[PDB]
Symmetry: D2
């Protein structure tokens, strides 16, 4: 699997479980095609989110529904979502991990890309 | 002015100057209408980005052109753009500052709401 | 003034007021001498923390009492303290701002150096 | 093993390999006893850093030598070190992961604590 996530909760000090997300692929006219969805497990991950065949070179957007996560925790969130948008170059089985650290009014996102 | 930004560069330890951005408001059908553009000054800020009259409650997106920023700094970036999407509640002259801390492969974003 | 701070609270979206801190400079033998203390105001800042005369080059530590801050906010914290340790190069009236973004189990810290 | 680290490099998008660190335990008179040292592997980790017997309840400091890491990468760093100081409550095999995200002038650190 070429696309992984890892979400952490900076209030409780745990992975962020049960965060819904969507993966989309940019189209030529500037639109977006939804290619996968899921909800993180208790480790803040979604295993086998997409296949290599689903992940050709191009621009991808991963939208994480952080607002619902905070509402369920009892916190008042600032952001509607956290968006991560990047150009993927999957040749040679290059892998992408999108790391995300959540607080009610803030997030940090980084990427780990293999070679 | 109800919407401010403060952008810092985590590599060189300065504000991030000359970062282009676009502000959009979400429509009832789920699309986006662009309402303003700007470019940060050497303090990482943009003065008078929009007016209160342009800022009813609703969902807004600020799209920061971080890819161009990092290319111009000479460092290969990861993100195509940095988007900050938030629901505004301006009643009571509430003001919003979007703070943004940039690295080539990472950013942190937070808000200060008065 | 050559040393400033800016502390934000990532839970409530405000500056972090009433955060206590202590500034120390490292001695030649590797110990620490405390040179100043302060407490942030409601903007998350401390004005006139030290003077240029108190700020030769060297290694400095700022110790922020984040555990007390979070206990007072009513949220269990992880860290006992947040320490920022850096080598200062004041020649040329160079000024340092320590930016700090706090959550109960996490912090981000960066610097703006003029 | 009750104490793990995970260090990432926010410039290159990789784990931060070959970062030296030290683990110390606070003493009653306010001093520090060094209990372990190591250097991260290419995954940004140190496996089996300490044992459970080495990790009684108390205050611990993990000092990461980030300055040398950036000098080797060719960057000019701000911080001398990154310090993480916390009170450990290891009963019930509670585990601590210290996550650290590095840039030349900035770091983010969070903890993942099990239960
Ligand atoms: C403290 C900070 C961080 Cl941690 C990251 C990005 C900008 C900032 N700074 C600010 N954010 C909001 C308003 C003012 C500032 C400032 O630095 O003056
Ligand atoms: C270190 C870290 C930070 Cl600083 C923020 C969010 C997730 C992580 N953790 C990871 N990121 C990527 C891959 C693995 C991990 C992990 O913690 O196992």
């Amino acid at each position: 699997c070429p696309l992984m996530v890892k979400i952490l909760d900076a209030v409780k000090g745990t992975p962020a479980g049960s965060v819904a997300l969507k993966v989309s692929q940019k189209t030529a006219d500037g639109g977006w095609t939804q290619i996968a969805t899921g909800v993180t497990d208790a480790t803040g991950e979604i295993h086998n989110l997409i296949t290599e065949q689903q992940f050709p070179a191009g621009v991808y957007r991963v939208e994480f529904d952080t607002k619902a996560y905070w509402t369920n925790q009892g916190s008042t969130p600032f952001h509607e979502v956290a968006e991560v948008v990047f150009d993927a170059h999957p040749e040679g089985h290059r892998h992408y991990t999108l790391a995300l650290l959540l607080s009610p009014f803030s997030y940090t996102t980084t990427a780990v890309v293999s070679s």
